[PDB]
Design a protein around this nucleic acid. Structure first.
Lengths: 628, 449, 79
RNA sequence: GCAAAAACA
């Protein structure tokens, strides 16, 4: 470690990039997630009171708590209703243009988003197949269920989807097309159910974490509230989304004044938040901007449903008799999670207060920001999920201490509970860290969490080369890499790219090209690379013809549109090729026919969305017009 | 619009209604808070005591040598080694029984006969853990007694081994060959020439070192092993680790044997039997290795055999081990370009005296040696990556920042229950290089005036 | 003195499927007979089964291939 | 045996 701290010609801040476990395997989560999920569920109940009384906390419902009860010496879950209301008021009064643009978003383009964008989401646990399905499949199955059990056709807008969910939730009995039936309580429990799974490829901590994904029924509400949160976050200077750190770095203060710099993280960030605080925040903003009531319900339903979450507890606790091991569900035998036995509902478990990762990473940031807005907090704050940086600009050291302490207390007011061990404050400003960026005087250093893959993506030679060079270019643009690093990385990528496509040594492709007198004219064939550090933003084929390394006859041969095989800035060619109890493989093929007839008839869908009212048989209207 | 019983469904688990209307007046109360503290002492990391942690890595690292073979193909070199050598066991480990030398020699002969994949033999039973899961499960069922209890797993703490410093100083040794053959890119502008010159200088200052040869060996071994895992087999495959010096001669680092490896999940382990040419044997450094004597052309070599299982993800990651060169290259490039921005002069041969803390003393040393040792330490960290290393580095970034702040004449303040050293200490259990970094941090002064 | 063996009154270790298995090896595999007691039961120098005369032993790949020394039957219960 | 709060064998 003494070798990572230079004392001359270079400061430790720049060499802190060496304190990264690059090029090593990322930690991988093994076994059952039941213990981790149970711990995640039980943490918020252990921090509600200063004295740990878990059993009393399992029946609290609304997590509002009185002052002189928030744990100031440790984690504290819950929130103070009056504090939340006042802080939301203060945040609403400030940042008026952000509120006006939120009003624009919620009045004009809110009833405009297509509901098909839920297909580009994350893995979803289907409530009909009783397993995990891709998001487009889950969306299609859910809309078929809605059509069957509601009899009204779903409109293109996602407001129609939300109305359909709300209407179908009031039916006492529902049946899917097979021909399985759902009770209303069963469907409600499925909506409450949260599918938890291990979080993979997570570097930066010793202990593995679990993330939870919502059901497709509530995903529309989750997406609308998340989109509103993102829209209001893009237009506030205290958010963690844009150059904010560099902007605050380029700040000059008074000649003789105390300028603090607090950089820290959040401990138990998802184990100390209550959806009711988010409810209060959103209701305050909506009420003081002047939206109608149906907007109130539309924005409040997601947290209402999340207050009754039924996160799945994995596969069960691990019990060992001798050398044997067994997986046992909670409650079968005594353990350290006996207080949650009463809340076990089948394979799932009920927890009224608490949060999970991957659900609301923007509304939590909004809650933290509304906590920031106060009177005596005359400083600069940047918040992004569980990481933050704060700049103090006051006149006295004790004033800075009071500001930091009231910042901590106000964060605790809504239950943020920043980690004391992870928070570092520097009396003179100039050194700090936020996200993976590092601050030293007037320079901010961007250090990547992951190195570029430096390997072909794995689709086709031209696409893989284009994506690799673009990734290297993005890495060098963000300041993470420089001349030497960029050139070395592109040499490494060139070697890996040539190896992966049988262009190194003796192999089938090289022997085939040698025996038939086929001269390798491209990088994937085995030719010398044409791309340089400056020219890495140029296409290979376009660059080779200018230098005379690719004869026009060869271009005619390869760029033939009548070719057997046929952002990505690569021209199509012969090298643009695609590598070769479910009971669902047939319907993806018949959907292929539906997608096949389109993009052959309509140039329009290749430009914009399919905005054609009706159009069930109605496609014949276009074909007749083509003839006419 | 909202339904009637749907509102009851929403409200059955919360005190407030669908649209909350609190009756409390909005106000922020005044809560008594603790006092922020300040520290003169840099945190002192606790050093775990216990047995020294052995070498736990896929390959050997520093104790890696090769047999020079006559020029030819891989099959020719393997045939030469198999036909010009005799094996006698020196050290036997209960973890790796000496009977696996039969599997190794069978694989060598089969590869020499043009058959990289060979049929199973009896010695392969205890070489790849065939039917080991069933054996253990049935034995546990037969010998089960008592009552079920919680798993209550535990990780044994281990102390800093003495060989980590030996590893660091041995990877520095000069080599005759360059060991880094990366094909140069094109050059069109003068900035491209600058970048290529920087890369060439970095390669020529780190290439002729033992760590570069070990990196090449790791890359080749991992790539050859990974290229065979995709095909679901039931027969033993041999993947020689052979390089070529710039005279045509074949350098035999060792052989890795891949068992049946009926792999399904991308994280599933694959049985391996790794044979390696060792330089010096050590009982406490290689307790699970079996060391054999090797006699080729009246020369002495040590052959080490270990039984390991290694996942496909880790093998793929280590097949891209050449990426470890970026960070030392980053440091070297930043230093060189700083001493080009100082006076508008790119020298490309600047070797500043870098001041560091050595054996608890402040002394300076050349940039080239510093980059070499950075590369060696980064390689050691990369081959020893686990959650302990991840957490240790992540929580050490803060202490590194605080140390830099107090070197730059700044004051560091902490909250009430602020003990940043605890999060670093919880990640120091048995990782040799985490312990090495902890001792390196502890050797530096904790007070700055 | 805990029995640890069938002839000493311990519970049977042999089963229908394990008629062919030796008692001592099966008990060692199942953990019913610890290594410390194994080091005593299988002593080739125990007085119980000590022979009256020295016996010759092979030595595979040794300078002296035959060594003659006093010997005992390994099991102390083979009296 | 690999690996760490249990998965592969």
């Amino acid at each position: 470690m003494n070798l990572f701290t230079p004392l001359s010609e270079i400061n430790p801040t720049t060499t802190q990039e060496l304190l990264y476990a690059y090029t090593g395997p990322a930690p991988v989560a093994y076994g059952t997630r039941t213990r981790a999920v149970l711990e995640n569920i039980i943490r918020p109940y252990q921090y509600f009171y200063k004295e740990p009384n878990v059993q009393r906390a399992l029946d609290i419902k609304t997590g509002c708590k009185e002052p002189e009860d928030i744990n100031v010496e440790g984690p504290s879950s819950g929130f103070h209703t009056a504090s939340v209301l006042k802080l939301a008021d203060n945040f609403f009064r400030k940042y008026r243009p952000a509120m006006e643009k939120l009003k624009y978003w919620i009045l004009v383009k809110l009833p405009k988003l297509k509901y098909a964008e839920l297909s580009k989401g994350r893995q979803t646990y289907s409530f009909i197949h009783k397993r995990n399905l891709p998001a487009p499949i889950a969306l299609e199955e859910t809309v078929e269920f809605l059509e069957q059990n509601l009899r009204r056709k779903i409109g293109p807008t996602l407001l129609s989807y939300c109305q359909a969910i709300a209407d179908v939730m009031e039916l006492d009995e529902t049946t899917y097309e097979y021909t399985i039936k759902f009770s209303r309580e069963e469907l409600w429990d499925q909506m409450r159910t949260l599918n938890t799974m291990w979080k993979h490829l997570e570097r930066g901590r010793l202990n593995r974490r679990t993330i939870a994904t919502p059901s497709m029924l509530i995903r529309g509400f989750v997406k609308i509230v998340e989109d509103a949160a993102k829209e209001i976050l893009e237009n506030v200077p205290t958010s963690g989304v844009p150059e904010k750190l560099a902007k605050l770095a380029s700040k000059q203060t008074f000649h003789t004044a105390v300028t603090g710099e607090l950089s820290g993280d959040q401990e138990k960030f998802n184990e100390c938040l209550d959806p009711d605080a988010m409810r209060l925040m959103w209701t305050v903003f909506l009420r003081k901007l002047g939206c109608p009531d149906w907007i109130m319900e539309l924005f409040n339903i997601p947290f209402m449903v999340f207050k009754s979450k039924l996160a799945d507890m994995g596969e069960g606790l691990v019990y060992t008799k001798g050398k044997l091991t067994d997986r046992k569900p909670l409650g079968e035998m005594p353990s350290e999670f006996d207080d949650l036995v009463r809340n076990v509902v089948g394979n799932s478990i009920s927890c009224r207060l608490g949060m999970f990762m991957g659900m609301y990473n923007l509304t939590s940031t909004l809650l933290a920001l509304i906590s920031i807005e106060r009177e005596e907090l005359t400083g600069s704050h940047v918040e992004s999920s569980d990481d933050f940086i704060h700049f103090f600009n006051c006149k006295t050291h004790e004033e800075m201490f009071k500001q930091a302490e009231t910042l901590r207390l106000t964060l605790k007011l809504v239950g943020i509970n920043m980690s004391p061990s992870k928070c570092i404050l520097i009396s003179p400003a100039g050194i700090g860290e936020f996200n993976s960026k590092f601050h030293h005087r007037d320079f901010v250093g961007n250090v990547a969490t992951e190195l570029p893959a430096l390997v072909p993506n794995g689709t086709n030679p031209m696409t893989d080369l284009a994506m690799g060079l673009n990734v290297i270019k993005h890495s060098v643009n963000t300041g993470q890499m420089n001349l030497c690093t960029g050139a070395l990385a592109m040499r490494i990528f060139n070697h890996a790219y040539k190896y992966a496509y049988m262009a190194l040594g003796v192999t089938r492709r090289t022997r085939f090209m040698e025996e038939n007198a086929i001269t390798p004219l491209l990088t994937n064939q085995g030719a010398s690379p044409v791309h340089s550090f400056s020219t890495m933003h140029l296409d290979e084929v376009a660059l080779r013809r200018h230098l005379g390394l690719l004869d026009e006859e060869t271009l005619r041969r390869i760029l033939n549109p009548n070719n057997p095989v046929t952002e990505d800035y690569s021209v199509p060619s012969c090298f643009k090729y695609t590598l070769s109890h479910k009971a669902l493989l047939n319907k993806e093929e018949r959907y292929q026919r539906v997608t096949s007839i389109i993009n052959k008839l309509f140039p329009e869908v290749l430009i914009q969305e399919a905005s054609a009212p009706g159009t069930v048989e109605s496609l014949k209207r276009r074909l007749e017009l083509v003839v006419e | 619009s909202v339904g009637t019983t749907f509102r009851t469904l929403l409200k059955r688990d919360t005190d407030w209604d669908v649209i909350p209307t609190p009756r409390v007046e909005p106000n922020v109360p005044r809560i008594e808070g603790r006092r922020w503290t300040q520290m003169k002492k840099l945190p002192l990391l606790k050093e775990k005591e216990g047995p020294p942690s052995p070498w736990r890595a896929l390959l050997l690292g520093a104790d890696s040598e090769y047999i020079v073979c006559p020029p030819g193909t891989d099959q020719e070199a393997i045939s030469w080694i198999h036909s010009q050598s005799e094996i006698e066991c020196i050290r036997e480990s209960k973890s790796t029984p000496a009977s696996v030398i039969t599997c190794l020699t069978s694989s060598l002969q089969s590869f020499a006969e043009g058959n990289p994949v060979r049929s199973r033999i009896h010695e392969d039973i205890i070489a790849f853990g065939i039917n080991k899961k069933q054996e253990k499960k049935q034995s546990a069922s037969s010998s089960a007694s008592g009552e079920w209890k919680r798993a209550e797993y535990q990780v044994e703490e281990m102390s800093l081994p003495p060989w980590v410093e030996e590893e660091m100083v041995l990877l520095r040794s000069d080599q005759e060959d360059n060991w880094i053959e990366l094909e140069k890119n094109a050059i069109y502008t003068e900035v491209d020439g600058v970048a290529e010159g920087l890369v060439d200088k970095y390669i020529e200052i780190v290439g002729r070192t033992k760590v570069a040869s070990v990196i090449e060996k790791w890359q080749i071994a991992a790539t050859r092993t990974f290229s065979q895992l995709h095909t679901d087999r039931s027969r033993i495959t041999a993947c020689p680790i052979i390089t070529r010096d710039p005279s045509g001669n074949c350098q035999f680092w060792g052989m890795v044997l891949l068992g049946p490896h009926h792999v399904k999940r991308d994280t599933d382990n694959a049985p391996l039997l790794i044979a390696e040419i060792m330089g010096e044997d050590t009982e406490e450094k290689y307790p699970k290795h079996s060391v054999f004597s090797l006699k080729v052309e009246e020369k002495q070599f040590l052959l080490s055999l270990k039984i390991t299982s290694f996942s496909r993800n880790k093998l793929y990651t280590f097949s891209n081990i050449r990426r470890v060169l970026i960070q030392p290259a980053s440091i070297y490039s930043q230093v060189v370009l700083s001493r080009a921005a100082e006076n508008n002069s790119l020298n490309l041969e600047v070797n500043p005296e870098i001041q560091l803390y050595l054996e608890g003393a402040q002394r300076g040393m050349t940039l080239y040696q510093w980059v070499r040792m950075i590369l060696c330490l980064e390689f050691l960290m990369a081959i020893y990556n686990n959650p302990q290393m991840e957490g240790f580095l992540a929580n050490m970034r803060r202490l590194h920042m605080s140390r830099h702040a107090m070197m730059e004449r700044r004051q560091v303040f902490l909250p009430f229950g602020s003990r940043p050293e605890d999060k670093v200490n919880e990640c120091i259990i048995n990782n040799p290089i985490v312990a090495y970094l902890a001792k390196g941090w502890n050797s530096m002064p904790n007070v700055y005036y | 003195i805990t029995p640890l063996l069938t002839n000493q009154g311990a519970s049977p270790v042999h089963s229908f499927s394990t008629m062919h298995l030796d008692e001592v090896a099966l008990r060692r595999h199942l953990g019913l007979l610890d290594e410390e007691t194994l080091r005593r039961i299988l002593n080739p120098n125990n007085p119980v089964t000590q022979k009256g005369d020295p016996s010759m032993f092979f030595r595979i790949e040794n300078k002296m291939p035959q060594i003659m020394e006093d010997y005992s039957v390994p099991s102390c219960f083979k009296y």
